[PDB]
Every structure is written in C-alpha cells, then in structure tokens.
Design a protein around this ligand. Structure first.
Ligand code: ADP
Ligand code: ADP
Ligand code: MG
Ligand code: MG
Ligand code: ZN
Ligand code: ZN
Lengths: 647, 641
RNA sequence: GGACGUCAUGCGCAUGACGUCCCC
RNA sequence: GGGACGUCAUGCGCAUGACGUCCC
C-alpha cells in the first residue's frame, strides 16, 4: 500500500510530472520511499500509454542494493513488475545486456552500468528513468558523473532521453569558503544531473520537523594542560637518534609535517645507499607515530606500537635454517636504545593519571549519556583504524563501562591499502545487525558509518576529534535522531578541529542559502548557467583525455645486486615474481621473504600450480636505470612491462 | 625634552632594564618615540659605566630612514651623540665598516647591514642595541630573519651579545585558521627576535584608548543584479575566438583560473609551433582582462584596454622603410566589427559597475561631514588606481563637494603599469598633508610604514589581504569621526575573506594573551625549540640554493644560436651576428621581420646601436623545447661582450 | 635593467589518513 | 591481490597581482 507523507509528495511532484530533479530530504525522512513511489508512478503511466518502462537505480555501496530491495523496492513492485538487484558481489551467470532486456526495475552499483557502457550492447536510451542515490557524489571523475557525461554528451549533439532523479540529503559546498562559490558548486551538481530544479521541503516543513528529531549539539573541548611524561620520554629518544644519523627536522614532534619530512628522508637515503640514515628515518617514523597515538588513544597502545615493531626486527635479524652479519652498527644502536628506555615507557604507560585528557572527556560524555535511558545506543567516530581497534580494547579493559551498560565493538573499512587489516563486507553486517538487535550497544567506527548504511537510531553520536566536510558533518548528526539525541565533538585545543568544525557549520549555513538562491533564480538565468557548466564539464573530460593518453633491482637497505629486469615475470596481471635459480640463496623465510644479507622484507611466498614462488613488491627495492635511481610505489609506475610467467 | 606617556613607559620598561623584547603599540601611539627614549637611556648608561654604546635601527623602507631622523632621532640625540641615516639611495663615499666605527646611532635599511655581514669587517658584537622596525617581517627568508639567524647562531654556540628591540603594532597569525597555530606563529616571531616577552599596554590601556581613535566599521556590499551588457558582448567575442582556435576553457569568463589556463595554453602552443592557437590565447587573455576590469573599474577602461592592444598590432604588422596571418586578420576584423558597439555601449553610464556607485555614495556622504576631510581608497591593481583617478576627474560632482584626488602606486619595474619614483611618492604624500590633495587612491603602498596624514574615511575597494594590513588600514583612519569601509561585491568572496581576517585578528589578541601568561620554563623551552629549527630551515635552503637554438615564439624562425649571444654588464643579453641586421624591424622596439612579434629594444653601448633580447619572446631549443621567464633560469651562461 | 624578499589570490603535483566501487 | 574514484589533513611547486629592498 504505497502512500507518501505530505512533505514527501511536495518534493516528488515534479518527478511525477516527468521533470529531471534533485531531491534534498534529511536522514530519516525516507528519500528511498519517494524513489519507489516515483518508479511505480513512472512505470504505471508507461503501461497505460502502451510503452517502454525501464528504470535503473544506481548506488555507491553493495549493501545498499540488497537493503533497497528488501526494505523498499520488492514489497511495493515485485508483484507488479520485474525487479532485480545487481553488484560485483553478485554471482550471476547472465551478462548485463540481457539483464537490461529481461527486467523492469534494475538496482545496481553504478560501475556495473559504466562497465557495460564502455563495451549486443547497453546504452542510456534503454532506460527511461535513472535514479542516482547519494547524488552529491555526481561530481568530478566519480562514476556517477561519467555516466551523466555520456547523457549530457547526447543531449547537446541532439538537434529520446531518460528522466533523472537525484537523491541526497545535503549536496554540499565542495570545500568552498564563500557564498559565491557555494552557488557555483550547487549549480555544478545541478548541471551534472541535468536537473530542472533542486527540491526542498518548504510548504510542509513543519511536518518534516516532527518526523526527524534534530539532536542537541555540544563541543566538549580538552585544554591539554596536563604533564605529558610519555611524550617527553619519546622526544628524548628521537633526539638521540637524530644526532646519531645527523638528520634534523624542520617540524614539530608528533605531527604530519614531521611524518612527511621523515618519509622523504627515508626514500632519499635509500636511493643514495645511506643505510644509516634511512634505518634511522624508518625508526623515527615509528616513534613519531607513537606520539600522535599518545595524543588520541591511550599510551599503552603507543608503547605497543613500538614494542611490536622492535619485536618484528628480532625475528628478521636473528638467523635460522653463516654470513658477514645482518645486525648493523646502526641497527644494534637503535635496538639497544629502545631496550634501555623500554621498562621506563612500560611502567610509565600503566600510570592511568598521565593517559590523554580526551579519553577522560570521552569517558565522561559516555557515562552520563548512557545513564539517561534504559536502552540507549550510540556511535564514536574516530579518525584511524588503529584508534577504533584501540578504543574498543580501552572500553573492554575498564569494568565501569560494562557495569553501566556499554557493550562495544569496532566498525572499520574494507580496503587492503592500510597498515591495519580490514573487515569483510560480511563482517560489517554481523556487527551492524547485532547493533540494531541490542547485542552491541556502541559502534566505534571510522567514516564508514557516516553515509548510506541503515544503522539504528542513536541517543549519542561522538566525533572523537574527527572532522571531515559539511556533508559528513550533517550525516553524522542524522545518525543520532532518537529521543533526547546528542551530537558531541570531543577535540583538543591543539588540534585545530574545533575551528574546522566551526567552518563546516558556516559552510552548511552557506549551503542552505545557496539552495534558496538557485531555487529563487529566474529560469532564463538558471538555464544559461547550467548549459555553461555542462559545456565545461565535457571539456574537463577532454583535458583528462590528454593527461591519461600519455635495468637493475637493489635492496633498499643494503643495496645488493639481486635481480635484473629480465629475471622478473608477471603472474596473472599483478603478482610480479623472479625466475632465476641462483635466487633461491639470496633470501630467507620467516612468519615472508627477507634479504639474507640485511633482513629487509622483500615480499611473501605464494603457490601457483603447485610451485612455491617468491612474490616481490616494488616498495622494497631501488630500481637502477642507465645513473638515475628510483623507488616506485606501485609496479604500474615503471616504464617497461614484464611478460606473463606462462604464455 | 624626552618624555614618555604612561602607556609608552609600561611597554618600554623591560627594554630600559636590558631585556630583549617585542613591543606591540597601535598606529598613532608613537612606537618610534619609545625607540628614541630607549636608545638614549641605553647609550647614557654606557657612557656612565665607561663603555661601548653603539645602536643600529633597522628599517624596511628608504623613506623611513630620513623620516625617523627628522621627526624622532635627531631632535633628541644629535646634540648628545653621533647620529646618521643610511640607505642604498644615499650617495656616501664611505664604506659601512667605517660608518660603524665613526657613529653611535646608525639608522639604515636592514640589507645595508646584511650586505656588510656577508663580507676590516662588521659583525653583531659591534652593536649593543639592535632595534628592528616593523618586526613582524622578522620571518622566513626576510632580511630581518637572516640578520637574526646569525645572532641566534652565535647564541647557541656560546657556552658578548647585543640587546634587541622589536617594534610593531600587530605581529600577525601568518595565515592560520586555528588558535593553536596563532600561538605557534606568535612564538615563532618571538623566537626569531630572541624576545624575553611580547609586550602590550595592559595597565595603561584606558589611556591608550584615548590617544588612538578607533574608527566606525562598515561593509557596503554590492549585489550585482544589474544587467551587464558589456560582459555579454565580450563573452560572445571570446566564444567566437574559442571556436576559431578550438581551445576550450574549464573555467568562468573574467576570472583567475581562466587567466591561468589561457596563459598555460599560450605557452604550450608557442612551444609546439601552433601559431593559430597561441595568438588566439594571447588575444583571449586581453579579453579576459577587460572582463575583470569591467567588474572593478568603469567599462570605458575595459574598452580602452582592448583598443590600445589592437592599436599596437597595427604598428607592428604594417611595414615601413607577409606579417599579417589569417588568424591575425580574423581576430583584427572580429574586433573592428564589434568595436563601435562596445564604444557606444561603454558611454552609457547606467550600465557601469555597481561598486562605483557604492564608492561614489560612500565618498559623497563622508566628504560632507567635515569642512576639511581626508581619506584613502585601497584599490587592488595599479591600473585600477590610475583609472579611479580619471573616474573622479571626469565627474564634476566630486570636485564640487571638495574632492581633489590623486593616485599613489608602487616603485617596481615588474608591472604592466609604469611606476612612481621614490621622489614622486613624497610629492603626493606631502601634498596630501598640506590639503592640496584630498584623497589618495592607492595600492598596498599606503598601508604600512609611511607617515600619511590621519583620515576621516578609509575605503577598501574590494581589496582584502591579511589581518596585519587590515588593521594597518584601520590605523590610517583615526581622525575625529573616522570610518573604515569595505566596498566588495557578493561575487568576489571578499566580504567573507575580510570576515576571516576579523576572526584571525581576534585569535592574535588571544595568542598574545596566552604567550604572556605562559610560565617561563615552558616559554623558554618552546622558544629554544623554534630557534633550533629556524636554523635548520636555513640548512634545507642551503641545499636547495647549492644546486642550443633561439626561435621566435610566434613564427618559430631560426634566428640565433647560443654562441651568437653575449652579455653586456651582467644582465643585458645581446646578439653579435651581422646577418642579424636584416631579421628584425624598428618601431616606437625590436620586432620580427617575418611576423612582427616583439623581441626587445635597441640600446647604446660605447656609441654602438645594439639589439637587446628578452627571453620572454623566444622558444629555446636544446638537443626538448622551453620558454624561460628570466635569463637566469637557463643552464649555460654567456660571456661578456 | 638585474637579483632577492614579503603579502594576497588562483592553479597544479606529492605524502599520509579514511572511505568506496570494479576486476583477479 | 591489482586498478580506479572520492573525502580530510599536511607539504611542495607553478601562475597572476600588489608591495618592498639591495646591486646596475
Ligand atoms: N510514507 C511512509 N509511511 C510509513 N512509513 C514510512 C514512509 N516512508 C518511509 N517510512 C519508513 O521510514 C523508513 C525510511 O528511513 P531511512 O532509510 O532512515 O530514510 P532515508 O532514506 O532518508 O535515509 C522506511 O524504511 C519506512 O520504514
Ligand atoms: N611622548 C610624546 N610626547 C609628545 N608627542 C609624542 C609623544 N609620542 C609620540 N608623539 C607624537 O606622535 C607622532 C608619531 O606618531 P605615529 O608615527 O603616527 O605613531 P607610530 O609610531 O605608531 O606609527 C610624532 O610625530 C610625535 O609628535
Ligand atoms: Mg532510506
Ligand atoms: Mg612611528
Ligand atoms: Zn638487503
Ligand atoms: Zn617571428
């Protein structure tokens, strides 16, 4: 039984009458339900005018396909039309061109559609309604914009195109600081979705107000005026290393500019055969990491970060199943250095009084807010993955949290480009569905929790010194819309984060005023501006179309002669491997492939057709041409390509 | 008779007792008078302890040497000590090492002292008090910081140094947006001047308040909702050119990103022998210039900017004693077709910019409050100063109500507008205090340092820079019933940029209040750390600093080899081949014979008429091609003629 | 005329963190 | 495991304009 609330109608009306539009409805309003109502209405009128009704709903996240089916599309359309959900995760034995022709309502991740459009074929004439979910991403080189680039390309050259629905809560300002540049970004994503209007709940605003409960805002600041024993004890150690190698920073200890400098320094050193310098630079990064860990997490984690790093070196340096020797002077210096000051750090880390202030501010904000209701739920937005896994263990090892009600769990990302190891797509469901059950009470999450996914309503949402953009700001507030909701920001004065959130509050307020002006804009003006942005949106692709249209291997640490370019061959289209048979002797094995001479990590052992072969990563070698030298980050940056192992 | 007011004392006290400090006193308080009182007090105590008293007062501007002498230092110290003023403008036949030894009070531009320190020699032991004027410049690779880098270098290695006075009004925040990074910048320039404290008028704040009259603030915004006929008529013309060459922008018309794009495009085109493209890109810049001129100045100036540009091409293309390409004849005709329309449209006063009517309105009311009022208009570009002058001239109602105006621009030779002489700036500024000139239309030049008369109105005409210059500009208006106005348009972003500076200024006062309240063990340890890394910042620059054919950019002809070019003096590069006489033409200026592109200018050197060549106008071809901006960017150096 | 520095604005590139999608 | 995209922070470079200095 497919109703709409009065505000939902007001926003939908022009889409029901065929106009391409963007829809701005807050989190908890039910923007997807408006999509459903529009697909049906659109499709019914094509039946009743004896015509084609094919509707494709694009998303940016695999769980949103199956979530949009179960909870919105199937219940209201499966029994009248042919509905399907697609993704890369889907195991179908049917090509996408077929799925177009066999189905009426196609929900899928936008890249599935773009993959087909790349190239019997698929094209945008085949659909009559394209609904883009979270359309603020229709921007730059995003998939959504590449789709729309084609649509717009056809429009201008035509002198039979589908209808386009944009779905979002807040379109954004695109990092701008001026009300002029707010307009310009709004108009730009209006222009990318060829919208005849951006659409907001004006006439039924009072009704919307009651549906979504706006939370109570706080900014709990931490003036770090405590003594910082752990900091001081580390900066000592770092200065002892900086003298040893004679590499002096232009930057504060425990900060980004230091981290950038010390990484540039490790590279340069490695390129110039200066082991002593790079090894110290490598170690100096880990110490710098431990400082900023001490700023945010508990200091036992900072300690552990170092302890584990020096534990790893014991395995890689100590031999097993005769040499000049792996253990260098520089290595033995740094190892001893840490082993000397270790006990001090450990016994200092277990003093709870010198743990970070932010943690006591977090503790305080939790304890009061988890004692207002008998069944409360909440989220902590930490910045790094490690800080999620740590704050979990912080809550575990702390009986007062558990006693008052808090049973917590971390919720991180999926990627394989982090030093912390991810969660599976499936493992995220396991938590999030436990969260709505009440099994898990408190999500400690990275950005992952901010957009899209259906997470239970929250009584508290804590941004633990995390600020990103205006969009994510307002998304995070949307996650807390239960009774007596609270949106807290727990930063320190030294961060700059209180002032960055305050700029986002200014930006958000610009965004509402840029929407109010593009709406009030006379149509001759609006038309002429949108056409101009679209004309230059196509030219932005032409400049990238010119951009895109454009030896020996040595151990970074000890500079040994190991491999030629001819010795390396690709497996599949990614795993590069060596084929020489002297090569057996020049590496060692641990639990992982390390240099025999120096114990530097080279890669890992794999199996391929019952053969134990060595994988080599480009991280860990200096490439020598002929003379110029280089460290490349990923294999694709090299100039010559290697042949496949087996032809 | 050398007094101090009660606030001036409070601020000076620790300097009188020998402590290195920075002094923060508003514009109109008399910070220089505190320098005078400190030099005398310092020098008197060295006489009376039978010892060396040598004091060097560094400045950043040549007029401030002669101004500090006349109006502060000589009247109170010439009759008791040996006072002198130095600069690069000074015509002395005496080396600086001598001037050190012969004089007690040495006022000079800081580079004079650094030149000597570079290298009987000069060094910082020779002075006992160094007073740095406008010490907020003691930053980065500024001269003031290179001086202090040496001072700090000696300090750390010593295990007999002078006292150091920092003079400023507002030290700044250094572009920061966080109260954490405000502290960090304050501490950094505290650390560069080795100050024991930043010093502000707290105990006698009420008295200071009365001395300096704080102006009434306004932000007169212009919602440009008018029709813009001139704009539309130009964008038409630019689209006609963009189709012709097939170079399409990724940017708005009449803006910076367009200007950057269209300059990158002219270069690329010139490197790749694509005359058609570059010539259009060159012309497209001039059209883009005329749009942003239309945004700020009157539109007759935008028209004139184009007319004069196409007039120049008539001289360079028409022969005397084929040059005209298809692309050239296309663009020329194109302008000649749409010309009369632009001219007759430009003389319609109703379609001139709104900001000008907002300016007009803000002037007319504020120049009718007092019978003798004075004021300043801070425009952005030099052209917009010279234009707003002519705007006020050609407008009898300004003159009738009292306004007699004049422009006040810069000195440099790196602008498309031609400068004022050091002397010409005095001629205006001293006329301004006389009442001969009523209204200065100035670039940034008027904001810092120079003694300009007090103002009833100061207008920032869509100009915003940093917090420092903001507060400096407010300082220029401290007469009775003073007003500080900002006249920007909603499309600028400038109202919001000034609002960030207002936030930044407020951070600055709070960062000062915290470094002052900071316990000394903490303050010491932070200053020593910034100084330690300030020296390392020089070491990273000390590694940075320690690191073929010539073809006409337009027509790509073979003109000169590297061997054909020889330097005159250490700057004017010139060709010596004698086929070379034929390949250029002469106008009123050296142009290509084939295409009429400007190559340089004719000079005389030992009675020889020789051709100067600028690197702007040639594609350098190795064996790769390149356009270099200035000769020093090339890899091989040429011998002297 | 040359060199150097500072400020504002805009553009581009790099590093790190976070997230996503597609493919094997 | 590879490729692409986006977001945040930081750093670097180039362009335009304005200003200053020093040496010619
Ligand atoms: N017209 C309606 N009548 C009744 N319930 C509705 C209606 N629209 C939406 N809902 C309910 O609200 C839910 C939408 O919540 P949510 O997904 O948070 O909104 P959004 O799509 O804005 O994020 C639906 O799943 C449904 O349970
Ligand atoms: N203690 C004082 N007694 C008398 N006049 C003073 C005193 N201090 C300053 N002045 C006057 O103030 C003028 C200097 O002010 P100004 O240069 O505008 O301030 P600043 O040095 O802050 O730029 C001098 O010309 C002088 O006549
Ligand atoms: Mg929903
Ligand atoms: Mg003064
Ligand atoms: Zn090795
Ligand atoms: Zn030529």
């Amino acid at each position: 039984d497919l109703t709409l609330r009065d505000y939902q109608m007001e926003v939908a009306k022009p889409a029901l009458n065929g106009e391409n539009i963007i829809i701005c409805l807050p989190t908890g309003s039910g923007k997807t339900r408006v999509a459903v109502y529009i697909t049906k209405d659109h499709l019914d009128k094509k039946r009743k005018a004896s015509e084609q009704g094919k509707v494709i709903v694009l998303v940016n996240k695999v769980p949103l396909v199956e979530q949009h089916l179960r909870k919105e599309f199937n219940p209201f359309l499966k029994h009248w039309y042919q509905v399907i959900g697609l993704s890369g995760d889907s195991e179908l034995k049917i090509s996408f061109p077929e799925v177009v022709k066999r189905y009426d309502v196609i929900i899928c991740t936008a890249q599935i559609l773009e993959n087909s459009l790349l190239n019997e074929s698929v094209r945008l004439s085949d659909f009559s309604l394209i609904i883009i979910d979270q359309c603020h991403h229709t921007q730059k080189e995003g998939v959504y914009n590449n789709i729309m680039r084609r649509y717009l390309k056809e429009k201008i050259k035509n002198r039979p195109q589908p209808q386009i629905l944009g779905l979002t809560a807040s379109p954004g300002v695109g990092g701008a600081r001026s009300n002029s540049k707010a307009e310009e970004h709004i108009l730009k994503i209006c222009a990318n979705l060829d919208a005849c209007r951006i659409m907001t709940v004006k006439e039924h605003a009072s009704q919307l107000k009651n549906q979504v409960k706006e939370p109570f805002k706080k900014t709990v600041i931490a003036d770090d005026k405590r003594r910082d024993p752990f900091r001081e004890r580390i900066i000592e150690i770092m200065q002892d290393i900086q003298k040893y190698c004679q590499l002096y920073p232009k930057s504060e200890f425990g900060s980004q500019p230091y981290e950038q400098w010390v990484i540039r320094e490790e590279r340069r050193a490695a390129k110039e055969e200066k082991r002593k310098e790079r090894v110290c630079a490598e170690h100096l990064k880990k110490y710098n990491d431990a400082l900023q860990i001490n700023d945010t997490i508990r200091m036992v984690d900072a300690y552990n970060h170092l302890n584990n790093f020096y534990k790893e070196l014991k395995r890689r340096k100590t031999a097993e199943s005769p040499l000049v020797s792996k253990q260098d002077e520089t290595d033995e210096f740094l190892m001893r250095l840490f082993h000397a000051k270790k006990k001090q750090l450990k016994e200092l880390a277990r003093k709870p009084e010198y743990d970070n202030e932010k943690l006591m501010k977090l503790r305080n904000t939790l304890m009061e807010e988890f004692t207002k209701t008998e069944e409360p739920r909440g989220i902590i937005f930490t910045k790094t993955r490690q800080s999620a896994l740590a704050l979990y263990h912080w809550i575990m090892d702390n009986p007062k949290f558990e006693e008052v009600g808090i049973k917590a769990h971390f919720l991180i990302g999926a990627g394989h480009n982090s030093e912390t190891k991810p969660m599976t797509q499936n493992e995220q469901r396991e938590v999030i569905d436990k969260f709505r059950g009440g099994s898990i009470n408190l999500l400690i999450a990275t950005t992952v929790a901010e957009e899209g996914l259906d997470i239970k309503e929250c009584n508290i949402v804590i941004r633990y010194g995390l600020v990103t953009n205006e969009i994510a700001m307002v998304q995070a507030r949307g996650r807390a819309r239960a009774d007596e909701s609270t949106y807290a920001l727990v930063a320190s004065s030294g961060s700059g984060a209180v002032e960055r959130e305050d700029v986002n509050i200014f930006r958000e307020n610009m965004m509402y005023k840029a929407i109010r002006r593009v709406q009030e804009m006379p149509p001759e003006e609006y038309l002429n501006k949108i056409q101009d942005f679209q004309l230059q949106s196509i030219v932005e692709k032409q400049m990238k179309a010119k951009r895109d249209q454009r030896i020996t291997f040595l151990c970074k640490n000890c500079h040994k002669l190991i491999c030629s370019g001819e010795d390396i061959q690709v497996i599949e289209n990614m795993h590069h491997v060596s084929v020489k048979k002297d090569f057996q002797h020049l590496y060692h094995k641990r639990e992982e492939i390390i240099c025999k001479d120096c114990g530097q990590v080279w890669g890992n052992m794999m199996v391929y057709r019952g053969l134990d072969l060595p994988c080599l990563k480009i991280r860990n070698f200096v490439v020598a041409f002929e003379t110029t030298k280089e460290i490349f980050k990923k294999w694709g940056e090299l100039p010559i390509i290697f042949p496949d192992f087996d032809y």
